[PDB]
Design a protein around this ligand. Sequence first.
Ligand SMILES: CC(=O)N[C@H]1[C@H]([C@H](O)[C@H](O)CO)O[C@@](O[C@H]2[C@@H](O)[C@@H](CO)O[C@@H](O[C@H]3[C@H](O)[C@@H](O)[C@@H](O)O[C@@H]3CO)[C@@H]2O)(C(=O)O)C[C@@H]1O
Ligand SMILES: CC(=O)N[C@H]1[C@H]([C@H](O)[C@H](O)CO)O[C@@](O[C@H]2[C@@H](O)[C@@H](CO)O[C@@H](O[C@H]3[C@H](O)[C@@H](O)[C@@H](O)O[C@@H]3CO)[C@@H]2O)(C(=O)O)C[C@@H]1O
Ligand SMILES: CC(=O)N[C@H]1[C@H]([C@H](O)[C@H](O)CO)O[C@@](O[C@H]2[C@@H](O)[C@@H](CO)O[C@@H](O[C@H]3[C@H](O)[C@@H](O)[C@@H](O)O[C@@H]3CO)[C@@H]2O)(C(=O)O)C[C@@H]1O
Ligand SMILES: [Cl-]
Ligand SMILES: [Cl-]
Ligand SMILES: [Cl-]
Lengths: 170, 170, 170, 421, 421, 421
Amino acid sequence: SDTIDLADGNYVVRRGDGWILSRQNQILGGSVISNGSTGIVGDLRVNDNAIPYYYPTPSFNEEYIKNNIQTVFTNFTEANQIPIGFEFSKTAPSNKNLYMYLQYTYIRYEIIKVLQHEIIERAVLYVPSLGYVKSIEFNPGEKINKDFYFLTNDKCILNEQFLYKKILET
Amino acid sequence: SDTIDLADGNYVVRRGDGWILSRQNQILGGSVISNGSTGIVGDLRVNDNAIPYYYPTPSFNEEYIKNNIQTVFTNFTEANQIPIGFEFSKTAPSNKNLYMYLQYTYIRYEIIKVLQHEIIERAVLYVPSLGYVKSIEFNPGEKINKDFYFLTNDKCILNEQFLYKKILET
Amino acid sequence: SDTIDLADGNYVVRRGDGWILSRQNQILGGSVISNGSTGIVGDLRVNDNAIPYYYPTPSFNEEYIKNNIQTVFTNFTEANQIPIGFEFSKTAPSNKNLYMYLQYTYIRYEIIKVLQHEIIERAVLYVPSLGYVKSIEFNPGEKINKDFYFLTNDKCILNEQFLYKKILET
Amino acid sequence: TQRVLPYSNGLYVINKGDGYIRTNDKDLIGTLLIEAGSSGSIIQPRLRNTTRPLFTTSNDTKFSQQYTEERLKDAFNVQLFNTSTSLFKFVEEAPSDKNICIKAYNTYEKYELIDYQNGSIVNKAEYYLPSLGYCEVTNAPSPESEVVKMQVAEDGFIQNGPEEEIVVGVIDPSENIQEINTAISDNYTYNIPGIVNNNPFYILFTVNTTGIYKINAQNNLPSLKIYEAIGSGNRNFQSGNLCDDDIKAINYITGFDSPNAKSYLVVLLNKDKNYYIRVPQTSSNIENQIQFKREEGDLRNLMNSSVNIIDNLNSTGAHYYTRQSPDVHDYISYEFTIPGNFNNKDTSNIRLYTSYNQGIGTLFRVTETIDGYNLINIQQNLHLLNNTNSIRLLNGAIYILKVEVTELNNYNIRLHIDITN
Amino acid sequence: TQRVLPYSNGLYVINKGDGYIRTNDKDLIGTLLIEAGSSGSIIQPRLRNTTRPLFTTSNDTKFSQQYTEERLKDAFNVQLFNTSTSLFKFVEEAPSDKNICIKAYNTYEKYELIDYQNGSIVNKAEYYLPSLGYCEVTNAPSPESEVVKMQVAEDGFIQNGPEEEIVVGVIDPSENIQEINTAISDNYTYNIPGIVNNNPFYILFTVNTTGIYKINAQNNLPSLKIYEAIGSGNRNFQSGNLCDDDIKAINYITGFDSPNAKSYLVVLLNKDKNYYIRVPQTSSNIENQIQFKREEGDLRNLMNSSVNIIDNLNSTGAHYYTRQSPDVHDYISYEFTIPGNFNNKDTSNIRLYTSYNQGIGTLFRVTETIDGYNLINIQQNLHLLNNTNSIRLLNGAIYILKVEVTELNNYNIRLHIDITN
Amino acid sequence: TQRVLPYSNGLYVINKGDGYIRTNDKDLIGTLLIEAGSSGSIIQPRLRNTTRPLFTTSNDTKFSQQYTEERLKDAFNVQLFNTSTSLFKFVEEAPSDKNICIKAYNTYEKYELIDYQNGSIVNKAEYYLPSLGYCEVTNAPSPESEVVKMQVAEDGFIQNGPEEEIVVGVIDPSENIQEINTAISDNYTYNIPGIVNNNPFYILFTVNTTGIYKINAQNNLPSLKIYEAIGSGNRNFQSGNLCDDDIKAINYITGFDSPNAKSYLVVLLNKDKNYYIRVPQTSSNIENQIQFKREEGDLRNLMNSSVNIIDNLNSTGAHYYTRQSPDVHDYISYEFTIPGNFNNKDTSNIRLYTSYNQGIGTLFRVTETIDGYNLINIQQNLHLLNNTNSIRLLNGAIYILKVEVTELNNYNIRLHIDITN
Ligand SMILES: CC(=O)N[C@H]1[C@H]([C@H](O)[C@H](O)CO)O[C@@](O[C@H]2[C@@H](O)[C@@H](CO)O[C@@H](O[C@H]3[C@H](O)[C@@H](O)[C@@H](O)O[C@@H]3CO)[C@@H]2O)(C(=O)O)C[C@@H]1O
Ligand SMILES: CC(=O)N[C@H]1[C@H]([C@H](O)[C@H](O)CO)O[C@@](O[C@H]2[C@@H](O)[C@@H](CO)O[C@@H](O[C@H]3[C@H](O)[C@@H](O)[C@@H](O)O[C@@H]3CO)[C@@H]2O)(C(=O)O)C[C@@H]1O
Ligand SMILES: CC(=O)N[C@H]1[C@H]([C@H](O)[C@H](O)CO)O[C@@](O[C@H]2[C@@H](O)[C@@H](CO)O[C@@H](O[C@H]3[C@H](O)[C@@H](O)[C@@H](O)O[C@@H]3CO)[C@@H]2O)(C(=O)O)C[C@@H]1O
Ligand SMILES: [Cl-]
Ligand SMILES: [Cl-]
Ligand SMILES: [Cl-]
């Protein structure tokens, strides 16, 4: 369940890179390449696409979340002011069509309150990382799995992580 | 001749992409690459290299040409404000010299007046598209065909087209 | 020694491209690539990295050096206002680590005074040219030669040159 | 030959796929003629961030571009419409044999915003969000064939991307969202506040323990609908409390739109999910309450469906009841009482059937004990469509028919309850 | 050993090729030492658009940089001189065996602007338009050979691009361009307007039907020249009218510069082309007209050439006539009358020859009928250079000698007409 | 088990290597999951030039960030700390078989600034200069193993670059640099100016001819140190003069820090190099001079080392003299007089040994002639460490012991001169 072998108190948790968000998958658009050609899509992490997603709780408001995350782990406010690019390349096989689409990835951070080996409260922060492309080869009129286009729940395309540090009182 | 199986009236005609203009061929300059190296020339279509070439007639002035072309086909005034790049790559073979030069390509549009299966008046608009490179391998002092450098009449490096729509009166 | 088969007088000398300076070798930093990946480092020669290094003498002050060099050889004041880029690519072999670092290269110019087949005075100017990368494959804890990191005296990574012109009096 | 859209009343945003281009080369970026052995690239470097979305509406005053964009944000979380920082680039190396052409087009991702009401679209908007391009390569054209004249095509789009139809319901922004801040356990009674009088509204709530719940208003009036917030409960969490993530993307679960119809909901709710209840416009000034009850008994067999309470069954003969048909593999239920006095002996002949939609039905005998409602399965695998089979049931007894739609031929489902004797 | 330049008087812009670099490394961008297996790139990204064209003139007050640029625009339609948005980039992968160097140079496309007058250049300007670079790769230098001192080279350029000599004539901007707005059919008479008195000027005109035309001034004075507008008639078109595309790039067809010489033009004109007639400076206040006539008869045999009217042939003995020599494979014609009374019996011995240039000549007997001028071919394949062969012609008769230049040894062609008896 | 640092007193900047990253992913740029056959890139394009150097000091008031940066500039000529125009980019093509991940980290080049005084660090600063990145590729993670929780690491760095320790001494900025503008030939006497009274200072000088020089103050007090300017003499040159290139990066050659110890220097100087002499803080108001003398005779055998003048050797028994130990393969010398009257017959037994450091010693008999000082090698390959061997030397005679350190076990070297009889 939400059971964890830790003492009572609050913790900052780094849940890892490679998280993608639900519903958001195709909003950047995608490319259609055909017959031997190569498609390259990329992006540039600055300013207003690097603005993170907060999800506070009665105990853990946004400022509390930001300060504790930036103290223990990476300071995303300083980092995301400096443009970083990323690109992906796909090559269409001969006489076939390929569709590739792009979505951002995030580092997932958590603030958890633990009481009697149990997580009773959890705040979440998603900080924009880089990106991820999915591609498929298709025929005209071929039905495509809904799962390829649309993600119902947040998932990590990598191995999830759990890197914790106990937060001490003011 | 200028005979066409159409009814009487005025028409907008899209004559296709890939048109190059006379005399203009070498004005962007060219590159000389040698012995295994790769040369890459490119350009960026914005502002004052995307300004189109009008050729009006007593019936068809510039504004008439612009409005009818942008209504039926692509609106080049909106499009050419947004930078688009293009590149070409050539590789010199070992122990040989290669010269490559760049020139712009255009979409050719026409406004024609037809009377008794005959084109009696024609206005022309060239809208900047992308570009085109020609290359040749050469020896020191080798005479090169004049045709390689200099184009006497406008031609289409692709297949010409004739996509028409009859213009109706105000 | 400093003996030269020339008549008496002052000379501008172009000593060639590809000069690297002492102590300066690692100040731009370097990249560590691993296991099949490719690392690409580059730079952009403009403004305040293209500012040259003067080394005047009682006879040959800076303005004298600049004027005589820019008259006979390339005018670096005009040239270095226009950005020029350069890049280097290295690929790490599988299951090995590669470290690559970048340093600028310079054209070395000299103003020499010759008296009785002897160079009795020499002024030096280093004008920023492009760059140069050195790379090494390394194991954890492997001792690396000091010479790989640190250059004690200025040297030319290419063949040195001696292109001279006698300077005539005002 | 139109498809039947068994959608509940409300707003939907539909991603109709990527790689749409306009007709007559209106979105042609250009063509590159690449000689053999050489390479060519077409690049969108985003030196300017400006993009040009396309928009058409059937109703400028409700489905404006602003409104439509807010709906696309509600559904798919799109936030950039005018702009983009996403680069795209097409590269082609021509083979050693022949020359090659590449044509690059700007593309659009097509979104449709519909207002679906009682079996048809009453408002419709199309939003073409600027996408990441289409690149077709072809062999080099030969001299000269000959140029054959062609009339321009009609205005419209062509899809070059793969087939796609992603349907996402969205919260109607004109209606209030009330919240139940405490997670629901076994029982809960939500009093309908005067702050949202008469107008339809939503109730956002979550549940403590995954289980099956009966939900209804007083005397089962009005009928309610329940939605699931898509992707809810994946993030912030507080034990025994509701965490609102402002998710307006909703999946319809069950519920009728006809407000004068008595009904209740029996649904499986996850503790790691948030749910919306929509209570409709009520034409009465009387105070009402929404009742939540966790089902531990036989009523669990009715999930997930709305149960229609049928009241007017007091004479013999033919009776029919029309509702919105559930989609294929979805359920609808009916609770009815056989007319006459219950004396445990007097019986009637009952024929249950549908008119157009095929459904598999199971019949339950309902008896209420001091332990709750008991359901005795007395008939299985009833094929309802034009069913001629009949069964003898007890006068004055209570039955529940649970129907699974298997063939959707009509927007409505028409249940007939014919009684003889 | 200088080449003979058989150019007509006027302005020419000559593209002398691409890939020019200055001496003494003045245009060296830099060198990259690439280790084996690795790659290296030198890039001109145009983060700044500024370029540095080079310019030298023999006459600052006529051939200024502004003027010269306008002439390059007239000839090749160059419009950016200071700037460029065109990127170039050189990439080199060193082989697995050895290391590699690449040197990149900035380059120039060399344009020469000349004012050519009566067999020599009277004004000259060189414009070096910034081009797209030169990249030489070499093997890695070995330690150390030894550094050998070298004196700097003289100032100048070196071409690394392929051989090129593209010669384009241009309209003299100081002279007016008058227009004939109506396309020419069978006949036309252009009255010379007072708006352009005394000064030389151009007449822009087109033709309705492709055919051979005789063009001349009153009494064939003065002599005219005709040019073709390069690349004209490819665009806008109006039936029976002239469409001026402002093309100043001109191809010389035929015509003499000596204005006191009687002559007329016989040229093949295309209906899908525009043409310029240049009428020279005339030292007379008398009204003049340019006459256009479509030739349907034997005069068609004289295309394309100017026909010199020879008048002073009224005594026996030696006579010579000097004109600008046509280029190889081009024509020049002479119309003359054998001295004496035409009595259809009295005859003279005629010797026709050239002094330095070799030419193939054909002789026509001219008789005028009520149907026009008739040309009887009476002599073919006459080799004119120092020709000793002679022919007996009729006194008082009219002849036309059409000469094709086959060997150009002199800027002038000198025709001799020696007559004995 | 600490290493012995045989560094002379002063400032040092140490490049401790490249590719340092912080713990707990603080410098992670991000991860790319690349599908098989595809490629992925992570790019630092320098659209903004801003970088973020890291800095820690033990003494904010002397080793401030400003000061530390000036010291890094003195040592390695770093000039950009906040900024960078250097791009880096990582590219990975996944093999046809499996998927691939690439993680990119920002990196730092670690510089340590130390103030080393009498065998320990008294001030210390670490400057982490932003570098050009670290890229690790790994196979694609499999579903799901299982997530095992881990406590964060302690704050600190991890090196991913190759091992590096480059030690560069730097001029102390608080001390004046005086210059000898004339190159030194055979002899030179530098008078110590009042502009730099009492305080320690440097003397910058060069030499005319490569040779071995004896350098000392009046009566060999105080003791001096000599440095070489790293990379000097590679550039500007004037015959017989000093050319100051403002090089503050110095290589210690020889010299003691104890100012009350009598000594002189015997060093090999190159004419194509500049050298710094450091004269220490003197507690006397008496005028002093630095004397330079070119050695052409036997004193050349003492290069490169400081020679200690031992004065207190006037009784028999045990005597010891402590100095800073030279590094391995470096030299230290001692000039002493055997106590007693020189009568060319009376002799004493002398035992020379070290306490902790192993050294190879050679003993010279010193006699001064009118031709200078003569050195007679009377003992070779003396192994000093706990040497029990003894030799009989003449009372009143002068000897020089030259010691080469071969094993450095102690910061100090302790020479014992035991005399019996
Ligand atoms: C046995 C019998 O009388 N059956 C009638 C049924 C029942 O009265 C009803 O189903 C029990 O709840 O009703 C029938 O007609 C109703 C049906 O068309 C529904 C469709 O949702 O709507 C009802 O009218 C609605 C109207 O559509 C609303 O817009 C609003 O005006 O309110 C009224 C309700 O008051 C119809 O009455 C049926 O076919 O189910 C007719 C049966 O004869
Ligand atoms: C048989 C005879 O007399 N031949 C003389 C010819 C003819 O008079 C003439 O060709 C008939 O048109 O003329 C010769 O000399 C002329 C010749 O050099 C031409 C060259 O183009 O120019 C004439 O002088 C020009 C002068 O060059 C102009 O600048 C300007 O001043 O006008 C005069 C003309 O008035 C020469 O008269 C010939 O060689 O052709 C001499 C023959 O003896
Ligand atoms: C035979 C004898 O007396 N030996 C003593 C020697 C000699 O006096 C000396 O080496 C001759 O120059 O000195 C010994 O102690 C000295 C030694 O520790 C050195 C180390 O560099 O420093 C001297 O004191 C310094 C002090 O360190 C400075 O900070 C400053 O205060 O000045 C004094 C000098 O006046 C010690 O005297 C030795 O071990 O070499 C002791 C021997 O017994
Ligand atoms: Cl039905
Ligand atoms: Cl001749
Ligand atoms: Cl010791």
